[PDB]
Design a protein around this ligand. Structure first.
Ligand SMILES: CC(=O)N[C@@H]1[C@@H](O)[C@H](O[C@@H]2O[C@H](CO)[C@@H](O)[C@H](O)[C@H]2NC(C)=O)[C@@H](CO)O[C@H]1O
Ligand SMILES: CC(=O)N[C@@H]1[C@@H](O)[C@H](O[C@@H]2O[C@H](CO)[C@@H](O)[C@H](O)[C@H]2NC(C)=O)[C@@H](CO)O[C@H]1O
Ligand SMILES: [Mg+2]
Ligand SMILES: [Mg+2]
Ligand SMILES: [Zn+2]
Ligand SMILES: [Zn+2]
Lengths: 403, 403
């Protein structure tokens, strides 16, 4: 295959999500949906009376559901969060200003999301394609927590004053805004709950979100495919425009990202309504895109496989990454996987490479790594593979407590 | 050792927790704390200004913290939950009445509990002895979700009208109250989120909870040890009094429970205040109990070890259960565990035996079993070990869809 495309749809479930799902199903592809459950509460200020129908359809159809936070951080866009806050924030268009504030509260929005999803669909955990507790994406933010060595932030994603498309807006990736600094801490809190978070390579969107009637300015399928071709193996998160969409320190050439392109789009762009003639204009683009992408030799996959699942009978090279039971691992040596050689906290063939900061077993730590253990921070003074009896509080050769 | 005692303390963290912990520390034991975070918000109507200090002290001292729900189900004791609700329910004493209503909302209380703990103590996940997301106990209810074949419910725990100790109160285990039925679904919801729940063998308590000044009538250390001795291998959950503390269908003789006694008590009983002189009277009883139990040949363990942890080097017999990373597994083959053979979703030496009802990988299913899969229920028609390819919807020879 020329490469793998991951269609990711953010900000559903809304009425428009239904026909989108239908197109994916007619196109013969699975996608990943990053949902905000406030639409199920009917307070997300969209056409959303079919929200639960959409959720069920997405899952019944075998699409992956991931966590996009309960309310898309709209609580940070308003004075007091309530039923009108979505409309209120839509009135101002201030979504990317002060987007993140209290990272603890903001991370909690991800847990609340799951409460709400599991309330409206009490059976959701019986779907293996429900990954709301393993996979996440941050509102506004091309930020990544994939592996211990594959982590990077959207350093201009959100602002403390001006919108990124306004005159006078300035960003200094070396000195990110307060909103971005909070969003980084949110990334880290989720990683410690065992989430992976992913950004994107390309965005099926208007040039910027200041553009009026956004749904009326999506790229056609062919040019969009050209854009995908361009993004393939070209470290697209660093070159992407506009500036607030970049991941400046994305690890170019990282093997996990090779031959892959993650597409971001929004369900709401596929609706005839207040953003333009999205259903009429853009549903066919999506149908055509999927068709011509396959013809070009691309395959489509979902974000639960972005990190390839560990698989018996597969030969791994030392240093290769797999996903196993929601946990990322790294091959200690080149070998062919056997049934009883699975990655674990004691496997000799694998070390844990989750993108977390809490001290964890069977991790290959490097000098300078900082870990959290029983509420204190410790510098890794000597590189080692962690194990149960080498806890940072009692192993002063391996760890030094920070001041 | 004669046996293992699991000291388990419910309803914290409160001011009284501090000196409880200290006595445990002085006695050289670890215990398990089933906490309700509403005390951290200061609305649980106890002396609880030191609630955070207590939480930190339990964790720092190495005690296990488990989930008891955010508000101990007081939202079901009042018409509108708020800051005064604890007080309001304490005025009427109606805690065991309609305690469980909407099982989905009630289960969500357990997840809200974790959000609140992680708000007041944002480093809490960096403690390995933090087991809030793995171990739980339902308010009022001697119910168990331990393994696929070790589950039983408290069929008279809560009522639809009278307090259990009132004249006129009747309970029929064969025809359980609606509150009991709701609690049974809560159990099942939690299990499908990967929780184990455990009840208790003996309760260090007043005769029943209608007893005024309940802290004043706590069994002395020596007689309490007698109660424990009697509980050892005697299926105490079936013989326990009062009626509402029973687990009527507890699997007597079940291998995981042999030589073990789980003790329930409440931090609030060790306080000098509104329930009697608990610190003065009861802390010394705790201290002495710990001392004499050790002398009698008992050891103390915590609930994260109740299902013994899989350990490299240990020999297991086919049919034995272990816990590994929060998941129960049953040995397929008698053997001596090695590094590379951790129990898992793909092990040929272990099958998953979590007490869940959702279809799950690598479970030894038996004809008659019923599983949930993508929102539908299926009857196991032929015994088999589940695997990724053998999903209920595509295996009409292994499963039969139910109406
Ligand atoms: C991945 C991501 O979060 N991208 C951002 C978009 O979600 C976002 O648009 C706004 O989303 C809100 C939540 O659904 C809507 O309430 C709001 O109406 C919508 N704004 C417009 C103009 O449609 C956009 C724009 O703020 O930014 C992306 O970064
Ligand atoms: C483990 C368990 O749930 N045990 C039950 C106790 O929680 C319960 O006592 C009551 O607990 C509430 C929650 O902390 C308190 O608000 C309430 O004041 C307290 N009752 C008294 C009289 O102190 C008891 C009795 O309701 O039943 C147990 O089964
Ligand atoms: Mg994970
Ligand atoms: Mg578990
Ligand atoms: Zn979004
Ligand atoms: Zn309780």
């Amino acid at each position: 295959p020329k490469g793998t495309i991951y269609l990711t749809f953010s900000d559903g479930p809304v009425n428009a999500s239904v026909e989108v799902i239908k197109v994916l199903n007619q196109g013969g592809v699975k996608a990943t949906f990053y949902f905000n459950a406030w639409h199920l509460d009917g307070i997300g200020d969209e056409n959303e009376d079919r929200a639960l129908e959409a959720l069920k359809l997405a899952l019944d159809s075998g699409h992956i559901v991931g966590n996009h936070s309960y309310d898309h951080m709209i609580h940070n866009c308003v004075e007091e969060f309530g039923p009108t806050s979505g409309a209120d924030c839509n009135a101002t268009g201030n979504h990317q200003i002060h987007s993140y504030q209290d990272p603890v509260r903001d991370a909690a929005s991800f847990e609340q999301n799951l409460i709400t999803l599991e309330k409206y669909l009490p059976t959701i955990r019986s779907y293996p394609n429900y990954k709301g507790y393993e996979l996440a994406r941050l509102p506004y933010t091309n930020g990544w927590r994939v592996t211990k060595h594959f982590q990077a932030d959207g350093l201009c994603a959100t602002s403390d004053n001006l919108k990124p498309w306004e005159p006078g807006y300035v960003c200094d990736p070396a000195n990110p805004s307060n909103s971005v600094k909070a969003s980084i801490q949110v990334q880290n809190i989720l990683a410690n709950q065992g989430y992976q978070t992913h950004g994107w390579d390309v965005d099926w969107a208007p040039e910027n979100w200041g553009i009026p009637m956004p749904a009326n300015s999506l790229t056609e399928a062919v040019p969009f495919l050209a854009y995908v071709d361009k993004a393939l193996n070209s470290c697209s998160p660093t070159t992407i425009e506009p500036i607030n969409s970049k991941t400046q320190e994305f690890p170019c050439g990282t093997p996990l990202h090779a031959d892959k392109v993650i597409v971001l789009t929004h369900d709401f762009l596929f609706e005839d309504g207040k953003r333009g003639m999205g259903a009429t204009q853009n549903l066919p683009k999506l149908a055509e895109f999927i068709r011509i992408a396959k013809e070009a030799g691309y395959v489509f996959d979902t974000m639960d496989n972005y990190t390839p699942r560990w698989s018996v009978g597969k030969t791994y090279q030392a240093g290769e990454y797999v996903l196993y039971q929601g946990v990322v691992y790294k091959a200690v040596i080149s070998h062919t996987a056997q049934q009883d050689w699975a990655p674990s906290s004691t496997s000799s063939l694998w070390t844990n490479a989750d993108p977390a900061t809490n001290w964890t077993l069977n991790v290959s730590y490097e000098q300078g790594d900082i870990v959290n253990y029983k509420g204190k921070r410790y510098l890794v003074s000597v590189p080692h593979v962690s194990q149960q009896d080498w806890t940072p509080d009692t192993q002063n050769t391996l760890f030094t407590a920070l001041e």
